[PDB]
Design a protein around this ligand. Structure first.
Ligand SMILES: CCCCCCCCCCOCCOCCOCCOCCOCCO
Ligand SMILES: CCCCCCCCCCOCCOCCOCCOCCOCCO
Ligand SMILES: CCCCCCCCCCOCCOCCOCCOCCOCCO
Ligand SMILES: CCCCCCCCCCOCCOCCOCCOCCOCCO
Ligand SMILES: [Zn+2]
Ligand SMILES: [Zn+2]
Ligand SMILES: [Zn+2]
Ligand SMILES: [Zn+2]
Ligand SMILES: [Zn+2]
Length: 296
């Protein structure tokens, strides 16, 4: 079992030079995904299978000078937030297959609490608040249905497991809908943990599926291409200007490079991430997540 806290930020702090070297500086100049908070619990029903629960809030933002304007700007994403909770099954079907199946309920809109959380954060640090929260994406309550399958060929070399994990993912519902395909490569001291990967709404955000006690470590790099049918954060209508602000791009790539290091019962993770332009007038953006996972 693992209990995890994960924080995502486009401001990568001491990891900014690494993020910039990896994905280039223009991606850091964008601000599309501005904050994430996630708390999750995974329980092993067997050595092969987990059931996970989580609650999370993700906050999305216009970029650059648009952040300070009174309302949403045509051509850039509006302020929005996605507040969600759900359950997921994560299982090794065999030594060569991992699958995941999950359902969220949530909301994108003022009810997701993005203005409240960001305004609070800003007040606490003495930053000014961004007024265009008044023109945020309007409420839509909904569900996500999520699935992933991954092949898991890996070989063990002197206690180091190295693997290649081609995967297909799918999300549906009235908030987000896409079909993704990708692969991750990983090296680490645990076969099960090495195959436990994911992108986008299938990202594990700190949750760990592992057999290992004592030292745990993993280093990984992956990309997933998704074909996007829906993204309500982009296609929804703003509260006051009543517009859809952008034309979504139907093909979106997500890159993730990261690592975990831990010792029973605590592990630390960092993931350096890039998402390619999600709309015609946007551009690629980079961010990190840092996770603390108690695993026992
Ligand atoms: C008992 C039933 C058996 C079920 C079999 C299920 C197998 C499913 C596994 C499918 O995985 C294949 C997916 O392959 C995708 C790999 O593609 C990677 C390319 O990613 C695009 C990267 O974009 C970057 C472009 O520069
Ligand atoms: C098998 C998965 C792929 C693993 C590749 C991971 C390589 C990681 C290299 C990390 O090096 C860290 C260097 O630290 C300095 C970074 O700062 C860059 C500019 O300053
Ligand atoms: C096909 C195996 C998957 C490895 C791909 C991982 C790529 C991550 C490297 C990120 O490079 C910067 C983005 O380049 C575009
Ligand atoms: C695959 C993950 C690699 C992460 C490398 C990050 C290097 C951190 C550099 C921080 O330096 C502080 C001075
Ligand atoms: Zn357990
Ligand atoms: Zn720049
Ligand atoms: Zn931010
Ligand atoms: Zn448990
Ligand atoms: Zn969720």
């Amino acid at each position: 079992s693992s209990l995890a806290i994960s924080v995502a930020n486009d401001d990568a702090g001491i990891f900014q030079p690494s993020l910039n070297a990896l994905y280039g500086h223009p991606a850091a100049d964008r601000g599309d995904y501005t904050a994430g908070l996630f708390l999750g619990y995974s329980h092993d029903l067997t050595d092969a299978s987990q059931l996970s629960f989580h609650i999370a809030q993700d906050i999305y933002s216009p970029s650059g000078a648009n952040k300070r304007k009174p309302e949403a700007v045509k051509g850039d994403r509006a302020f929005s937030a996605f507040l969600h909770t759900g359950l997921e099954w994560n299982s090794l079907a065999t030594n060569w297959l991992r699958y995941r199946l999950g359902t969220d309920i949530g909301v994108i809109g003022p009810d997701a609490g993005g203005q409240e959380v960001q305004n609070r954060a800003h007040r606490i640090i003495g930053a000014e608040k961004y007024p265009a929260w008044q023109d945020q994406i309007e409420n839509r309550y909904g569900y996500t249905a999520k699935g992933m399958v991954s092949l898991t060929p890996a070989i063990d070399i002197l206690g180091v497991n190295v693997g290649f994990y081609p995967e297909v993912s799918a999300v549906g519902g009235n908030l987000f809908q896409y079909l993704g395909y990708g692969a991750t490569v990983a090296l680490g001291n645990d076969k099960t943990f090495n195959s436990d990967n994911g992108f986008g709404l299938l990202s594990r955000r700190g949750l760990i599926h592992t057999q290992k006690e004592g030292l745990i470590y993993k280093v990984f790099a992956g990309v997933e291409r998704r074909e996007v049918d829906k993204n309500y954060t982009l296609q929804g209508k703003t509260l006051q200007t009543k517009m859809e602000t952008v034309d979504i791009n139907k093909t979106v790539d997500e890159y993730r490079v990261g690592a975990t290091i831990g010792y029973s019962p605590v592990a630390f993770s960092l993931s350096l991430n890039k998402v390619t332009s999600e709309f015609r007038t946007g551009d690629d953006y980079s961010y990190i997540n840092g996770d603390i996972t108690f695993f026992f």
